[PDB]
Amino acid sequence: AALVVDNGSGMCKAGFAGDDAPRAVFPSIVGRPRHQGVMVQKDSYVGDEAQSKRGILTLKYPIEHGIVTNWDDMEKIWHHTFYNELRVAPEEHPVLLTEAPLNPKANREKMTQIMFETFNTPAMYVAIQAVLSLYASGRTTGIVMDSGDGVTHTVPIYEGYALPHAILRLDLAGWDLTDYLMKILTERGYSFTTTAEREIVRDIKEKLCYVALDFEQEMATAASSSSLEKSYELPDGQVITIGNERFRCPEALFQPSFLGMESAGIHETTFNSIMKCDVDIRKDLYANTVLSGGTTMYPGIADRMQKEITALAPSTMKIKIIAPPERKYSVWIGGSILASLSTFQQMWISKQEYDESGPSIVH
Amino acid sequence: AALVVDNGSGMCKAGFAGDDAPRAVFPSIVGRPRHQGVMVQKDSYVGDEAQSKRGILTLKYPIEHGIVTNWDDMEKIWHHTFYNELRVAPEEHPVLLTEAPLNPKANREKMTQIMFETFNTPAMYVAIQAVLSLYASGRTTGIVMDSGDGVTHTVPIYEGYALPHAILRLDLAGWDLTDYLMKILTERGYSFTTTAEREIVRDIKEKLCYVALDFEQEMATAASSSSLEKSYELPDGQVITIGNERFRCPEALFQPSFLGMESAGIHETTFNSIMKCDVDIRKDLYANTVLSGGTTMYPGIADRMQKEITALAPSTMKIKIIAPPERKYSVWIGGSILASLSTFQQMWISKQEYDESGPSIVH
Amino acid sequence: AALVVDNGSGMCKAGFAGDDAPRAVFPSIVGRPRHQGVMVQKDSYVGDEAQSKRGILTLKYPIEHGIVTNWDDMEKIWHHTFYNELRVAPEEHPVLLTEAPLNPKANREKMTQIMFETFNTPAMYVAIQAVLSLYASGRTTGIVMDSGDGVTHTVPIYEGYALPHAILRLDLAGWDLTDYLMKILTERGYSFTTTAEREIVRDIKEKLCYVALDFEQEMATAASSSSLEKSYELPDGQVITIGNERFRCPEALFQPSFLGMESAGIHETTFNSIMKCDVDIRKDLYANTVLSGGTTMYPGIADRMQKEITALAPSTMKIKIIAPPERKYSVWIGGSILASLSTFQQMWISKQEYDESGPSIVH
């Protein structure tokens, strides 16, 4: 059985091909102690180990905006994934990895060198994340907008053919929303600064934030009452209350100028990607807009995306946003489907092909 | 039963001799994918298959101006015609094919070699398209002006005898009108460039274009109001509006200088063909001018042809333009009549005659 | 009832003895197609059939200058005459044929062999055409000037006796006038060249040409005004206008030098024929000059003949030109009278006399 590892910027999702859900889901973090030990202790902690001891750790993400910036810590996470989470020998199973489009070429080549020389996997393959999300929905036509912690990208596919010239990629994703929520929480006097407190803000974001259907009407509602106020208990028992920050944080996905970015929102990025495609396939892309990733899990984002794209598209087009309830695992689920196909078993890059063609075989 | 295949530049019309209408009518196109497949797909698409997937295809016509330029794609269309459209075994039926006059000799010889060596037809015959159109109208005397996608030709026939020295042929037909409509649509800011968008312009031409009775009076009407403006919805919901382009495009049939051509219009070509005939038969040709082909399906072309030929012919002649409502299928209908005649069953070129006389038997 | 067939160079006039007019009058032509048939058609056309389809035919006269030059086509005309025009069985009726004087001996012998061996007529007789014209006028004394399409001949007869030494024959007739009209029509830019266009010129000649009383005065009248101009509409609606060609064409009958001929005009030929007769019978020939044939049907030819012969004859002679209005059929009418006489029934050449005396019985 093949191993499917979906390693975006924020999470590591691993499991076996053929299953319907990842077996191991943990944060893609490496924590190191920032104090002195006095008791007569591991040197570093990975994943949920680092998340539970984060009070005395400095947390580091080895992947930033889809790109591995620390390859030593990236091997710790893969080692922790294989031996501690899945508890398998990686030299016995082919590994299917994922990657965002328009990534540096050296990123995929280093992933290949590590899988073949450090873990000694027999076969290997690197797929595009948005393509796997279309496998998960059981479609061959559609435009996938995948947004995780580091990357947001749109990939249009028609009848199984990708339109690579129409692929768009934004560096605006979940990390920027957490960073923005930290900034607007200072307006109420809540100061979060350390890497451990950044994990608390992300937990606040995932539990209290939502997408407003009309932002200006929602701002006027929050300024005239308190029906939108929600409380949240910090780990030390302190209770914070947030109001319009609940929908102002996800609003940066549609108005990136809140972050000082010049780019377009996720609705205009999806529309611009459709408009780069041929006129004859746009009608099918409008009706098969698929959301994927953890950053699409805000309540009300599918209704907001449909409203915003309807205002950009011609009035005779049928805008249909497909947001399955399991779309946080769509990349992994689609990778599990792909690695189980019989027509895919010739797509593997074996270790022999890597020894005779070098790392350039992965491109 | 014999097979009747009318394969002009634009369309493929196929059926069985004795029927009153073709059973298979599809565009004579071969589409190949111009992108990369990412889903784990045929290598080429023919006819209506290529027309529905044209968003991701490069469309190619194997016949250009009546002459087959790609014999590999021409066999794909004939193979698609026999096995997918008609669903017959071509080695059991004689095949009646059509061809424009004044074509290269090697074009008809290659059609004969393919029908006998690739499809193994028992018998075969290649007829002239304008002659078949006269069978469809139930006449033995008349001048047929047939205009399709690639070729416009006039063939005068008197009492069953053809006047080959009076046959005229123009390379101005439906393809040049579509190409001209694409050019004058840029005046309103509508840009069509790809082969898929050329199919959209042809659809615009067939639905909105018409022949003006007086061109200069029609130009003054369109410049003073908007009663001639029509809208058209593109496949992606965008709506374009055209005014004088509706009659300026078909006007190139009567004024080929709009295309930069030096040749004469279809009215002067018909008149020059009559004037090459003997003086004693011109009166019968004037009264039996038969229109045929898809390019004669513009509204108002019969009234315009009659007006233009009346101005060229002597005032005592009776100009009568015969434009039947089914004249888009006249070549096929006439071929179905001819292949069903008992006096035609000796005109077939059997495979034995082809083996003993070579490909020169077809001439 | 006997059959009377008057077959000159141009026309075939057939009917039954006793009638006052021929029942069948058609051009003595055989037309064959000069193009290729494409419609899935007789091999040749005779008479009015060839005249109506002459646009696609090559027209041939089997009789040239009174002499049959094509005996295969001559049988087609006789076959068409008996079975299609008269609709009789020629093996039941005696046939009276006509011939110009001073013809080759083999011409009359071949007519006899065909009538007895091909059509199996019971009896047969060949008469001289000018002698029959004198029967038609009810005279026994007179000089007959018969002019058709091929031959002009004068035969003087006195009290029922022919003067064979005074018979004159000219090869100047209607064919040469049509040929001359074609030549002088080029002066106005009218080009007639084909055998079908020669039939049009002959129609122009029969409708617009006339004999001028004084040629030089008529030439001066046409050169000073336009009262002599007449229009004529061609079969294709084109209108031609002719002036002095109307009387210049028939003037060749009186001045054969217009045709490059050295012979004398029809007036001097008639006078020379009278002067070869005995002095005692010339006075009766001067008073009984009978015109006959289609070439004598020009308006004003009787007044011109009288004026020209009066200038040649002594001033005390009474010149009387007899030009009956039915003189185009005089040979046939006279043959119908002769074949009905009871004293003629012993002049027939029966088939028994032909079998025992050979073809020399006809001379």
Place this chain on the structure above:
Amino acid sequence: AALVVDNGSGMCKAGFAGDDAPRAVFPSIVGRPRHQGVMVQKDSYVGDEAQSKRGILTLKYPIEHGIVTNWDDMEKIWHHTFYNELRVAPEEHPVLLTEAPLNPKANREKMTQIMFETFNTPAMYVAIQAVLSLYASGRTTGIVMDSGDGVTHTVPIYEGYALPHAILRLDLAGWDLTDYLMKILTERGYSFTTTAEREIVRDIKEKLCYVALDFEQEMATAASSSSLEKSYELPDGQVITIGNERFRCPEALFQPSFLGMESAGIHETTFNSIMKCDVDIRKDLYANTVLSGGTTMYPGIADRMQKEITALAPSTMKIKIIAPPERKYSVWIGGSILASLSTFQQMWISKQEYDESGPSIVH
């Protein structure tokens, strides 16, 4: 010195009487621009000027089949001839013009009106072209077959006397052969349609076409090998190859049915012209058959004419075809000889005789 202008349908040959060759030889064409000028250009081009710029011009011949159809363009060619080519004042020299026999009377009268009222020539004369060709050969007896671009005519002359009744004229000449070569070049896929491309086909005809001695044997030779194939480089570097079209095009001179014409070939036209002459002069005409004009410049036409006339003439006659190597200029050379004769100086039509006798003096 008198000016000699030989202006047939295709070429204009001009010079001075007494010289042995024309000084100016250029195509009788007038070209007008068929596009729009954008550079900040003459309105029309004549002769070699139009031939070099023919890519952007519509070429028109003012003379068609020996008859001037455009008198405005005919004056442009004469004006270009006098002032640009010969560089003389036409009001100082008498002009000798040429004309085909059996031309419309108004054609010669308009040439006289233009020479006297537009160019103000002192004297003028219009000669028959075939008569001048006999001066060029130094003969007083012979039949001249002159064939140019528009007209083919035969004029028999005996001891200095013309036989006008034996003059024959065909409208089959070089223009019809070029038009026929264009038609049979489509059999190999070579499409020439514009007036500029017609000049290219004429160049192909003059360089590659020849007359086959036996046509059926030559057709069998070309169908069994490739020794008759010749290549020709088009102006744009494209190379075309022609085989049996090299001798099929000139074969229309001997079999006009290839053009759909009913007329006889040039061999039968020459023979029919001799047979219209008196029996006593035919022997001298058989031995002095003179070829003239550009259409007689095909290799092998003299040997073919001799073979074809020998088969028509009695076996005891000596058929001698005189084809001088300079017979393309025979009409001009003979006109230069005639205009230099002292016994011709009274044949000029002075401007005084034209003012007192009108335009009818030229006939």
Place this chain on the structure above:
Amino acid sequence: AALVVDNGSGMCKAGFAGDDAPRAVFPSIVGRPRHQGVMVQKDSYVGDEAQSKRGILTLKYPIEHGIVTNWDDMEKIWHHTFYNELRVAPEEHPVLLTEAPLNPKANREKMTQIMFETFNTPAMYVAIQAVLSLYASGRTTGIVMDSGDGVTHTVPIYEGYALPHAILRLDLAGWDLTDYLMKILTERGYSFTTTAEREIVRDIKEKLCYVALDFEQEMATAASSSSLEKSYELPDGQVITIGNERFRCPEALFQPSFLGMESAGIHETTFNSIMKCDVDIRKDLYANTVLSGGTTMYPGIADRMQKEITALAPSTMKIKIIAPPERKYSVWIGGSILASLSTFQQMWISKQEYDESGPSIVH
């Protein structure tokens, strides 16, 4: 003195007629602040002002693909051109403007309305850009391939006459190459996204990119060494290094499939434009292929164009690419020559003609 304004998609080149170089050359951009001012600042910046402050601006091009999309910003650029750059009163000088062929009709009419109603110019004229480039080279015959930031178009001209039916236009130009360089720079981890960073990529393109003579040989050279690597210092001191991207970016001009476009390269577009012209003028167009515009300023593009057209043209044609070193200003230089011609002073459209004929006078 007349004003010459060459305003393509990317640059604005302005000056006075008669000069040899534009006086004002600045980017055709309008920048607006995308932040909040806190210092107690113009509302928008044009040209070099916007280019120097682009760090805090959003840069907008009012002309996209040759078509003005923002007429308010287009007036800001013209106002900045007249009053700030040239420092003249536009109501005193006639203005010569430029435009790409096959542009929307309303684009030229709005330019005319603004020049006459907003700037009150006395006279005005709009020329075609490729025609002006032929004035700059001192030629009247040649095919001009002009490529700027928005449009690539070929205009063949022969002897001063344009062939409008042979004009081709591509929407592939400098903007698409900059956009493509941004995409392939992500392969090395260089992320440029904002409109200010797009100006940096364009600067990289103009300094480091070149056209490879053989693309596949150049790709193999770059993959085997580092002799093609060049460094570039960003505005903030960061140094980027690019290898095969130097010639892969300009290669999209010859292989537009790199951009996902179906169209043909600039070499095949030039060849197809020549092949639409008459056969007689193609030889002169092959020898006078003129390059123009900023997108033709890549090193090695003239040698590559000659190599690619030589492979398409017949081997006997002489392909000569004329690439003057000042061809970035050819449109302006040619407009300066045209506006100084005395024969052009009647081509101006005065303000009186605009008031009496409306905006339709410009077409």
